Amino acid sequence: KVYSRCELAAAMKRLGLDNYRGYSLGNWVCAANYESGFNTQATNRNTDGSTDYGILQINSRWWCDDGKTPRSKNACGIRCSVLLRSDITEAVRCAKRIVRDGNGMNAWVAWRNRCRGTDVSKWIRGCRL
């Protein structure tokens, strides 16, 4: 599924991301925009045999099990396929773990590079949440 910006903002608000560990809703929408373009089916195969999955491009070496990543862990206790579903519930739950375990959103390269120095509230402009 390709979410609209505001459809994703509303879903993320419902699932408790607004101000989660100090990150306003627009951070998470911005991160999704640049990580996946709002496509739940996005993947990125890395050279090291890991793959980034879903709307927040969550990596299989650490966070989910895809059964094909050498020397890996599954900290979210999920199959990576659950991160390709239209329903973002499991992706959000895992993203919350990433931001707890990492003491922030720096795990997301695209958020670091495109979001953190901007007015992230722009990503919520117009949205009925």
Author numbering: 1 to 129
What text comes from the article?
These findings have been verified by our structures of DEL-I and DEL-III.
We have solved the crystal structures of two of the three isoforms of lysozyme purified from Pekin duck eggs (DEL-I and DEL-III). The duck egg lysozyme structures have the basic fold of the C-type lysozyme characteristic of HEL.
